Design an enzyme around this catalytic site. Structure first.
Site, PDB file in Angstrom:
ATOM      1  CE  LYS A   1      -4.332   6.327   2.484  1.00  0.00           C
ATOM      2  NZ  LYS A   1      -5.954   5.944   2.496  1.00  0.00           N
TER       3      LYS A   1
ATOM      4  CG  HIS B   1      -2.250   0.769   0.702  1.00  0.00           C
ATOM      5  ND1 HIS B   1      -2.171   2.154   1.663  1.00  0.00           N
ATOM      6  CD2 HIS B   1      -3.109   1.125   0.619  1.00  0.00           C
ATOM      7  CE1 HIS B   1      -3.380   2.500   1.472  1.00  0.00           C
ATOM      8  NE2 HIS B   1      -3.711   2.209   0.472  1.00  0.00           N
TER       9      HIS B   1
ATOM     10  CG  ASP C   1      -0.583  18.955  20.992  1.00  0.00           C
ATOM     11  OD1 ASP C   1       0.409  19.233  22.398  1.00  0.00           O
ATOM     12  OD2 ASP C   1      -1.975  19.331  21.312  1.00  0.00           O
TER      13      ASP C   1
ATOM     14  CG  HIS D   1      -7.617   7.949   0.053  1.00  0.00           C
ATOM     15  ND1 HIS D   1      -5.832   7.799  -0.421  1.00  0.00           N
ATOM     16  CD2 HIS D   1      -7.847   6.569   0.097  1.00  0.00           C
ATOM     17  CE1 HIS D   1      -5.220   6.337  -0.025  1.00  0.00           C
ATOM     18  NE2 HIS D   1      -6.811   5.777  -0.605  1.00  0.00           N
TER      19      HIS D   1
ATOM     20  CE  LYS E   1      -1.659   4.857  -0.915  1.00  0.00           C
ATOM     21  NZ  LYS E   1      -1.958   3.689  -1.287  1.00  0.00           N
TER      22      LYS E   1
ATOM     23  CG  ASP F   1      18.334  12.126  -9.698  1.00  0.00           C
ATOM     24  OD1 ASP F   1      17.661  11.554  -9.828  1.00  0.00           O
ATOM     25  OD2 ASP F   1      19.322  13.036 -10.389  1.00  0.00           O
TER      26      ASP F   1
END
Ligand SMILES: CCCCCCCC(=O)OC[C@H](COP(=O)([O-])O)OC(=O)CCCCCCC
Ligand SMILES: [Ca+2]
Length: 784
Positions: free
Chosen positions: A637, A306, A642, A635, A308, A313
Site C-alpha cells: 500500500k 487493519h 516525483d 500486498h 499493522k 522503546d
C-alpha cells in the site's frame, strides 16, 4: 452534469428558517455524489440549527449543488426538503451566501415559507500554492486539516519486502556521494522487540505466534530461531509491558480446513498468550454506517481493524552511552503472520525446502499444501520504520485504541518515565541532509479510538467529519489527494486494490450511486493527467496491482473486485483519451497511464524439492505447477510522487480503506527536506528506494528510469513489461522470467473501453475472467 468542480468546497450549513425524539440532519450532494453530512441534531425540531464547517474535496461533474434535509428517527426514517443552488453561482471564485429554499420532489416548494441557509465557496485546485509544484520547499508545512501534524527531525527506513539478502541490490548512487543501502524489515523488528525494556505494543489484522522473524542462514542473528510468540513471552517475563490488539473476526474457528483457507489465528493467538504476562486483546470492529438495517446485519461481521503496528522503546542513538530511551515505530503493509516472509527473489518453487517449508502460503487453489508442491504465493510488500517525534504519534494511536477497545488500564505511563524515556525528540538535526519530515494519517472513527475532539469546530480543524454514529478520521484519503494534487512529474503506485471514484463511473449495467466508492484517488489521478496534457507538460502515472486479489479467482468476491477495477480503469482511460483528443493528439493513452501486475516463472532445476504428492488432475493447481508460473502477490500500500514524497501504510486504494469509518488504517507520508525535486531532480532516499523496487521488478537498471516523467521511460517500461507478459503467458518455457513486471493483461479500446487480450479471457492456468463479473449476491459495501 456540465461543470467540473475540481478543488475544495468550503461550506457552512446554517439553518432552516422555518418549518412545520427527532434526529435531524442535512446532507450535501454534488448532483448525485454525497460529499458531506452534518451531525444528527436531535431533540430540537423546528428551527434545528447546526453550524458545521465543511472542508470538501471535489472532483465532480455537476449542474447543481443540492442540500437535503432528513430525519433518521428509529420510529422511521424520513426526508424533509431538497435545496438547489446551480454550480454556475459557484464556479467563479466567489462566496455565495444565500438564504436558499427548502423544496420538495416535483420542485415546487415546501410549507409555506422557509428556505435553508448555507455558505459556500469553491477554490479550483490551481488556487493552491502547491498545485503542480511538488513539495517545493523544505518549509512545506504538511497536509492541512488532519489530526496529526507534520513532524520534523525524523528518520524513516523504507522496507522492500520482509527481507533482503546480501548481494541483492545493485549500485544505486545517491546525492551525498553514497550508494543506496537496503534495510531489512523483520531483522529490524526482531531487534526492536528483542531489545525493548519498557513497552512493546502491536496491532495486526493477524498475528500468528509461530512465525520466526529471522530465517536467512547467511545472515544469522542470535536467538533468531525463536518464534515471535515465545519472544514476546520472554520479553513480558522480564517486565516489559507487552500489549497486543489483534483483530477479532467474529466467526468461530472452522475446525475443518480446505487449504487456502487463510485464517487470522485470532482465537489461537489469544489462547497462546492466556496465562502469560503478554496482554493480548481481541479487538472487534463495527463499522459506522452499514446502510439498511437489513444490509447492516449481513455485513457487520465483515469489517476489520487493519492497522499493522509495532511500537517499542529503544536505546538513544548514541556513540556511547548512556541511560536513556526513545520510541521507535513500524507501519506499512506487513502483518506478523504466515505468508508474509519473502525477499525480492519471490521464489515459486526454490524455497519450499528452506525458508518456506513451514510457511507455505497459497490461497488461490483449493487444497494447496507443501506436500503437493508449488507454486507458493510470493509476497511483495512494503513497510517502514519511523524514528523521531513521529514514532510517538503511532504510539498515541495505539493508546487511543487501547483505551476505547482494549483491556485493563495498563498503558505505560510516559509521565512516570520522564527520567528514562525522553519526550518526542528529533533523531537528527534539521540541517542534516538525511533528515525526514513525516506526518501520520489514519482511517479510524470515534467508535474505535478514544480522544477525538467533540465540538464541530475542533473536529473540522482536524479534518474530521460526522458519521452516522461517530466522528470520522479520513486523513489517509486527504493525504493521498494532496500528494496527487501537488504532483508535477510522475506518480508510482503499488497497491493491492485499485478502484474508486464510483460517482464518475459509466452507468453501464449498474446504477453508479448504488456503489458508494466515493473516494477521489482514481479521479484525482486522471484529472491530474488531464491537466498536464492541457499544459503541454510531461507527466506519467504507473500503477502496480496484483494479477487478481487474493482468493480463488472465479469466486464471487474476486470477480466482483476485478469488475470494480475494470470500471475504474475505464473511467480514467476515457478521461485521458478525451483530453488527448481535445488537443488533437493521436497517442497511445498507455503512454500516460499504465497498469501492471507482478509474476514469476522458474524452470525446474536439478535438486529442487520434489513434493511427495500432487494436485488433482485438471485443477488450477495442477496447471500452475506444470506451467511453472504464478503471480507475485502485490500486498503493497504505497505511493511515490516525483521521487521526493512517499506514502506507506496499510490502506488500499478502495473504499474499505479510504472511507474513514470502515476498516481502521494507518499510514505515514514523508519527504527528506534536503532532497526535493523543485529545481534539481530528487536523489535522496526515496529515489534510491524507487530505483531498488524498479530493479527488483524490471530486473535491470536503465538510464531512462532516472526520469520517469520522460516518454522514453514509460515506453521502455511498457515494452519490457510486454515482453515479460509474453514470457509469462507463453506455453513454452525456455528460461526463468528475467523480471517480474507484466503489463496488466487487458487492452484499451480506442475510446477507453477495457477489452480482453485475444486468447486471454481467463488468467493463465485459470477459468477466471480477467475482466471480472458483477455479483448478484455481494453488496457493493463489502467489495469496494
Ligand atoms: C474470495 C477472496 C476474495 C479475494 C480478495 C479479498 C481477500 C480478502 O478478503 O483478504 C483479507 C483482507 C485483509 O487481509 P489482506 O487482504 O490485506 O491480507 O481483509 C480485508 O480487510 C480486505 C477486504 C477487501 C475487499 C474484499 C472483501 C470481499
Ligand atoms: Ca518484492
Amino acid at each position: 452534469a456540465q461543470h467540473l468542480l475540481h478543488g475544495t468546497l468550503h461550506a457552512t450549513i446554517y439553518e432552516v428558517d422555518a418549518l412545520h425524539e427527532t434526529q435531524l440532519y442535512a446532507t450535501i450532494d454534488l448532483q448525485k455524489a454525497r460529499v458531506g453530512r452534518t451531525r444528527k441534531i436531535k431533540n430540537e425540531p423546528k428551527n434545528p440549527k447546526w453550524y458545521e464547517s465543511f472542508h470538501i474535496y471535489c472532483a465532480h461533474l455537476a449542474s447543481d449543488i443540492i442540500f437535503t434535509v432528513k430525519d433518521d428517527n428509529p420510529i422511521g426514517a424520513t426526508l424533509i426538503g431538497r435545496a438547489y443552488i446551480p454550480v454556475d453561482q459557484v464556479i467563479n471564485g466567489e462566496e455565495v451566501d444565500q438564504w436558499v429554499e427548502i423544496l420538495d420532489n416535483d420542485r415546487n416548494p415546501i410549507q409555506g415559507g422557509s428556505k435553508i441557509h448555507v455558505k459556500l465557496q469553491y477554490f479550483h485546485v490551481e488556487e493552491d500554492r502547491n498545485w503542480n509544484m511538488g513539495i517545493k520547499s523544505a518549509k512545506f508545512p504538511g497536509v492541512p486539516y488532519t489530526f496529526f501534524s507534520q513532524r520534523q527531525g525524523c528518520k524513516v527506513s523504507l522496507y522492500q519486502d520482509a527481507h533482503i539478502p546480501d548481494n541483492f541490490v545493485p549500485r544505486i548512487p545517491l546525492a551525498g556521494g553514497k550508494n543506496y543501502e537496503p534495510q531489512r524489515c523483520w531483522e529490524d523488528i526482531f531487534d526492536a522487540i528483542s531489545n525493548a525494556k519498557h513497552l512493546i505494543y502491536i496491532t495486526g489484522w493477524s498475528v500468528y505466534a509461530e512465525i520466526a522473524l529471522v530465517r536467512d542462514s547467511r545472515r544469522p542473528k542470535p536467538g533468531g530461531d525463536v518464534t515471535i510468540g515465545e519472544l514476546l513471552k520472554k520479553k513480558a517475563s522480564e517486565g516489559v509491558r507487552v500489549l497486543l490488539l489483534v483483530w477479532d473476526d467474529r466467526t468461530s474457528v472452522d475446525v475443518l480446513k480446505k487449504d487456502g483457507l487463510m485464517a487470522t489465528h485470532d482465537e489461537e493467538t489469544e489462547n497462546f498468550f492466556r496465562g502469560s504476562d503478554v496482554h493480548c486483546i481481541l479487538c472487534p470492529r463495527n463499522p459506522d454506517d452499514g446502510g439498511s438495517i437489513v444490509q447492516s446485519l449481513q455485513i457487520s461481521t465483515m469489517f476489520t481493524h487493519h492497522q499493522k503496528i509495532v511500537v517499542v522503546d529503544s536505546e538513544m542513538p548514541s556513540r556511547g552511552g548512556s541511560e536513556m530511551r526513545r520510541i521507535v515505530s513500524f507501519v506499512g503493509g506487513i502483518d506478523l503472520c504466515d505468508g508474509r516472509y519473502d525477499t525480492p527473489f519471490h521464489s515459486l518453487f526454490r524455497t519450499l525446502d528452506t525458508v518456506h517449508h513451514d510457511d507455505f502460503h497459497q490461497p488461490n487453489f483449493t487444497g494447496a499444501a507443501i506436500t503437493k508442491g508449488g507454486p507458493r504465493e510470493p509476497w511483495h510488500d512494503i513497510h517502514s520504520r519511523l524514528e523521531g517525534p513521529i514514532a510517538w504519534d503511532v504510539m498515541y494511536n495505539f493508546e487511543q485504541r487501547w483505551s476505547k477497545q482494549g483491556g485493563k488500564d495498563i498503558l505505560v505511563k510516559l509521565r512516570d518515565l520522564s527520567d528514562i524515556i525522553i519526550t518526542p525528540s528529533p533523531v537528527m538535526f534539521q540541517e542534516d541532509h538525511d533528515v525526514w519530515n513525516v506526518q501520520l494519517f489514519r482511517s479510524i472513527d470515534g467508535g474505535a479510538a478514544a480522544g477525538f475532539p467533540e465540538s464541530p469546530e475542533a473536529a473540522a480543524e482536524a479534518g474530521l467529519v460526522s458519521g452516522k454514529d461517530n466522528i470520522i478520521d479520513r486523513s489517509i484519503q486527504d493525504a493521498y489527494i494532496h500528494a496527487i494534487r501537488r504532483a508535477k512529474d510522475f506518480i508510482y503506485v503499488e497497491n493491492q486494490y485499485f478502484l474508486g471514484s464510483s460517482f464518475a463511473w459509466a452507468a453501464d449495467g449498474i446504477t453508479p450511486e448504488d456503489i458508494n466508492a466515493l473516494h477521489l484517488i482514481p479521479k484525482e489521478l486522471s484529472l491530474k493527467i488531464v491537466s498536464k496534457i492541457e499544459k503541454g507538460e510531461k507527466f506519467r502515472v504507473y500503477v502496480v496491482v496484483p494479477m487478481w486479489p487474493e482468493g480463488l479467482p472465479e469466486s464471487g468476491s474476486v470477480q466482483a473486485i476485478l469488475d470494480w477495477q475494470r470500471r475504474t480503469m475505464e473511467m480514467m482511460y476515457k478521461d485521458v483519451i478525451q483530453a488527448l483528443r481535445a488537443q488533437g493528439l493521436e497517442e497511445d493513452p498507455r503512454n500516460y497511464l499504465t497498469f501492471f501486475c507482478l509474476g514469476n516463472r522458474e524452470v525446474k532445476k536439478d535438486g529442487e524439492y520434489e513434493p511427495a504428492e500432487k494436485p488433482d488432475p485438471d485443477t488450477d493447481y495442477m496447471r500452475a505447477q506444470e506451467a511453472r508460473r504464478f503471480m507475485i502477490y502485490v500486498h503493497t500500500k504505497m505511493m511515490i510522487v516525483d521521487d521526493e514524497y512517499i506514502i506507506i501504510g496499510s490502506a488500499n486504494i478502495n473504499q474499505r480503506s479510504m472511507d474513514g469509518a470502515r476498516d481502521s488504517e494507518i499510514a505515514m507520508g514523508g519527504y527528506q527536506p534536503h532532497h526535493l525535486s523543485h529545481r534539481q531532480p530528487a536523489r535522496g532516499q526515496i529515489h534510491g528506494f524507487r530505483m531498488s523496487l524498479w530493479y527488483e521488478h524490471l530486473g535491470m537498471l536503465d538510464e531512462t528510469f532516472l526520469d520517469p516523467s520522460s516518454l522514453e521511460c514509460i515506453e521502455k517500461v511498457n515494452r519490457i513489461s510486454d515482453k515479460y507478459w509474453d514470457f509469462y503467458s507463453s506455453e513454452s518455457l525456455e528460461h526463468d522470467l528475467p523480471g517480474h513486471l507484466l503489463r496488466y493483461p487487458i487492452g484499451v479500446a480506442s475510446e477507453g473501453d477495457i477489452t480482453e487480450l485475444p486468447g486471454f479471457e481467463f488468467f493463465p492456468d485459470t477459468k477466471a475472467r480477467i475482466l471480472g463479473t458483477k455479483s448478484d449476491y455481494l453488496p457493493p459495501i463489502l467489495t469496494t
